[PDB]
Design a protein around this motif. Structure first.
Motif, mmCIF file in Angstrom:
data_model
loop_
_atom_site.group_PDB
_atom_site.id
_atom_site.type_symbol
_atom_site.label_atom_id
_atom_site.label_comp_id
_atom_site.label_asym_id
_atom_site.label_seq_id
_atom_site.Cartn_x
_atom_site.Cartn_y
_atom_site.Cartn_z
ATOM 1 N N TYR A 45 -18.957 -11.892 -29.656
ATOM 2 C CA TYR A 45 -20.193 -11.961 -30.254
ATOM 3 C C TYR A 45 -19.966 -11.487 -31.515
ATOM 4 N N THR A 46 -20.884 -12.058 -32.279
ATOM 5 C CA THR A 46 -21.247 -11.687 -33.531
ATOM 6 C C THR A 46 -22.194 -10.728 -33.057
ATOM 7 N N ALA A 47 -22.094 -9.513 -33.457
ATOM 8 C CA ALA A 47 -22.781 -8.597 -32.642
ATOM 9 C C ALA A 47 -24.061 -8.223 -33.171
ATOM 10 N N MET A 48 -24.109 -7.763 -34.428
ATOM 11 C CA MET A 48 -25.318 -7.305 -35.085
ATOM 12 C C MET A 48 -26.220 -8.446 -35.180
ATOM 13 N N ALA A 49 -25.525 -9.562 -35.287
ATOM 14 C CA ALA A 49 -25.980 -10.853 -35.412
ATOM 15 C C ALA A 49 -26.673 -11.168 -34.162
ATOM 16 N N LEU A 50 -26.023 -10.760 -33.093
ATOM 17 C CA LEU A 50 -26.367 -11.030 -31.763
ATOM 18 C C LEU A 50 -26.130 -12.426 -31.654
ATOM 19 N N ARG A 51 -25.116 -12.876 -32.335
ATOM 20 C CA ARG A 51 -24.847 -14.221 -32.347
ATOM 21 C C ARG A 51 -23.732 -14.311 -31.552
ATOM 22 N N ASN A 52 -23.558 -15.459 -30.979
ATOM 23 C CA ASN A 52 -22.382 -15.764 -30.288
ATOM 24 C C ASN A 52 -21.458 -15.917 -31.353
ATOM 25 N N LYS A 53 -20.470 -15.052 -31.370
ATOM 26 C CA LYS A 53 -19.475 -15.342 -32.275
ATOM 27 C C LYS A 53 -18.718 -16.516 -31.707
ATOM 28 N N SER A 54 -18.232 -16.550 -30.439
ATOM 29 C CA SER A 54 -17.538 -17.741 -29.966
ATOM 30 C C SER A 54 -17.349 -17.714 -28.488
ATOM 31 N N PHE A 55 -16.821 -18.813 -27.877
ATOM 32 C CA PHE A 55 -16.622 -18.826 -26.476
ATOM 33 C C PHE A 55 -15.478 -19.714 -26.034
ATOM 34 N N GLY A 56 -14.991 -19.620 -24.772
ATOM 35 C CA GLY A 56 -14.030 -20.530 -24.189
ATOM 36 C C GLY A 56 -13.745 -19.951 -22.847
ATOM 37 N N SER A 57 -12.779 -20.477 -22.059
ATOM 38 C CA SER A 57 -12.371 -19.879 -20.810
ATOM 39 C C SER A 57 -11.068 -19.283 -20.970
ATOM 40 N N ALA A 58 -10.890 -18.131 -20.351
ATOM 41 C CA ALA A 58 -9.684 -17.410 -20.435
ATOM 42 C C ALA A 58 -8.814 -17.693 -19.328
ATOM 43 N N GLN A 59 -7.828 -16.804 -19.302
ATOM 44 C CA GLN A 59 -7.062 -16.362 -18.213
ATOM 45 C C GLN A 59 -6.674 -15.000 -18.698
ATOM 46 N N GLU A 60 -5.886 -14.851 -19.804
ATOM 47 C CA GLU A 60 -5.457 -13.568 -20.383
ATOM 48 C C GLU A 60 -5.448 -13.595 -21.901
ATOM 49 N N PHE A 61 -5.400 -12.383 -22.537
ATOM 50 C CA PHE A 61 -5.780 -12.103 -23.911
ATOM 51 C C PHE A 61 -4.987 -11.097 -24.723
ATOM 52 N N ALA A 62 -4.929 -11.348 -26.055
ATOM 53 C CA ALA A 62 -4.602 -10.287 -26.959
ATOM 54 C C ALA A 62 -5.371 -10.577 -28.181
ATOM 55 N N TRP A 63 -5.937 -9.554 -28.864
ATOM 56 C CA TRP A 63 -6.543 -9.785 -30.150
ATOM 57 C C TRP A 63 -5.301 -9.619 -30.894
ATOM 58 N N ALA A 64 -5.214 -10.349 -31.975
ATOM 59 C CA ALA A 64 -4.264 -10.049 -32.953
ATOM 60 C C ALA A 64 -4.992 -8.952 -33.596
ATOM 61 N N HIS A 65 -4.312 -7.838 -33.397
ATOM 62 C CA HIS A 65 -4.690 -6.488 -33.571
ATOM 63 C C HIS A 65 -5.205 -6.235 -34.897
ATOM 64 N N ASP A 66 -4.767 -7.062 -35.808
ATOM 65 C CA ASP A 66 -5.045 -6.982 -37.173
ATOM 66 C C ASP A 66 -6.543 -7.030 -37.374
ATOM 67 N N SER A 67 -7.227 -7.728 -36.440
ATOM 68 C CA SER A 67 -8.603 -8.028 -36.411
ATOM 69 C C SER A 67 -8.739 -9.362 -36.961
ATOM 70 N N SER A 68 -7.954 -10.356 -36.536
ATOM 71 C CA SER A 68 -8.229 -11.636 -37.137
ATOM 72 C C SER A 68 -7.636 -12.741 -36.392
ATOM 73 N N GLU A 69 -6.932 -12.440 -35.325
ATOM 74 C CA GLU A 69 -6.543 -13.541 -34.543
ATOM 75 C C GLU A 69 -6.579 -12.938 -33.224
#
Lengths: 145, 101
Positions: free
Chosen positions: B76-100
């Motif tokens: 989420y776009t949070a303050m926005a309360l917007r959906n920042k985005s969606f999809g289906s997972a299985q497993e995850f890593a944010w690119a820690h940098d805060s951008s991927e």
């Protein structure tokens, strides 16, 4: 900021409300917010002259790519100046190129650049920045990037 | 746990309670008290999602949370309360940098 909530219907504006701060974006300042790109009052002379007092240099010898173009993307566009002294033009290819290029920097004095790009078939090149202002010669060489 | 992640202003925004709607996030508080002693919350929900999560993770600046639930990721776009985005997972890593991711 001190962040205050709204009622848009009919609001309220009151002394209280609490801050949070949000990090904003960088400002970078350019070499084109300041410059008027020009044609010279005296190129021949000026051209040389600017060398005289002013001149810093960087050389690279280009061995994996023999193209200006990367360089080109950074230079016409970063400086915002005119390539030339009849030494601008290149079609979708061209053998050699010089931009001897112009505009004037803020604080009045000018910043001047000659880029002789030389193709032997590697490119080795002489970038000159010459200036009528000190801060620009060091700058151009950087700024162009 | 619920899914929540906290902005360092001081709002742990969680969602839900336990199976309550997600509709309830917020908390910037307003006051101070002793270590042992206990504290007060604010009240102003946002949200009322559907997908039932089990992860919350903040953006690297708190900011963008990606939340997964029902197996898909709403970010989420949070303050926005917007959906920042969606999809289906299985497993995850944010690119820690805060951008991927």
């Amino acid at each position: 900021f001190t962040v205050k909530d709204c009622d848009p219907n009919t609001g309220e504006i009151d002394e209280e409300g609490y801050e949070d701060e949000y990090v904003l974006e960088d400002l970078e300042v350019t070499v084109a917010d300041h410059i008027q790109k020009v044609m010279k009052v005296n190129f021949e002379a000026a051209w040389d002259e600017v060398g005289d007092e002013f001149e810093k240099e960087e050389t690279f010898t280009l061995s994996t790519i023999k193209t200006l173009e990367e360089a080109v993307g950074n230079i016409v566009k970063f400086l915002g100046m005119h390539p030339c002294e009849r030494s601008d033009k290149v079609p979708e290819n061209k053998n050699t190129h010089t931009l001897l290029l112009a505009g004037v920097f803020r604080g009045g004095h000018d910043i001047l650049v000659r880029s002789r790009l030389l193709l032997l078939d590697t490119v080795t090149m002489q970038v000159t920045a010459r200036s009528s202002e000190e801060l620009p010669v060091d700058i151009i060489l950087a700024s162009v990037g | 746990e619920p899914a929540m992640s906290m902005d360092a202003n001081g709002k742990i925004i969680w969602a839900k309670h336990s199976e309550v709607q997600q509709a309830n996030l917020k908390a910037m508080g307003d006051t101070e008290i002793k270590d042992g002693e206990r504290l007060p919350l604010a009240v102003k929900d946002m949200g009322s999602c559907e997908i039932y999560p089990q992860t919350i993770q903040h953006n690297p600046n708190g900011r963008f949370v990606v939340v997964c639930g029902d197996g898909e990721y709403i970010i989420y776009t949070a303050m926005a309360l917007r959906n920042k985005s969606f999809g289906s997972a299985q497993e995850f890593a944010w690119a820690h940098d805060s951008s991927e991711y």
